[PDB]
């Protein structure tokens, strides 16, 4: 059975902190920002070329 509000482990104040300060949204923003400092994947066609195999058609 789904639990009711009164049987919740977290206090209302902590839940309200997460609610008003957008905790998971800031976690998402941080994960996005981490990509900004990684090596990109692009290659510079037509000066470079993607992989080609003997079987290519």
């Amino acid at each position: 059975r789904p639990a009711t509000w009164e049987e919740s482990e977290e206090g209302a104040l902590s839940k309200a902190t997460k609610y008003f300060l957008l905790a998971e949204m800031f976690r998402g923003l941080y994960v996005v920002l981490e990509q900004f400092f990684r090596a990109p994947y692009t290659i510079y066609y037509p000066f470079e070329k993607g992989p080609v195999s003997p079987r290519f058609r």
Binding site: Y45, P46, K49, G50, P51, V52, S53, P54
Partner: protein, 68 residues
């Protein structure tokens, strides 16, 4: 990209480890004709003109008169 010679085109694509100049003589095609490289000529007067390589299926009669 059409100006890359064949063989180098494959190397640049990571097709092979060894560049064309470094390949042994055994693994080079033998040619009985002169080798000529020509890139893509589209948008130029050198573009390919296709045509039918066969003469027509049915050959008409060459008219000749005879005297009665």
């Amino acid at each position: 990209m059409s100006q890359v010679e064949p063989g180098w085109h494959f190397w640049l694509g990571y097709g092979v480890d060894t560049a064309p100049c470094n390949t042994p003589k055994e693994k080079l095609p033998i040619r009985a004709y002169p080798y000529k490289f020509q890139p893509n000529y589209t948008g130029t007067p050198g573009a390919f003109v296709t045509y039918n390589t066969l003469k027509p299926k049915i050959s008409a009669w060459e008219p000749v008169t005879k005297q009665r």
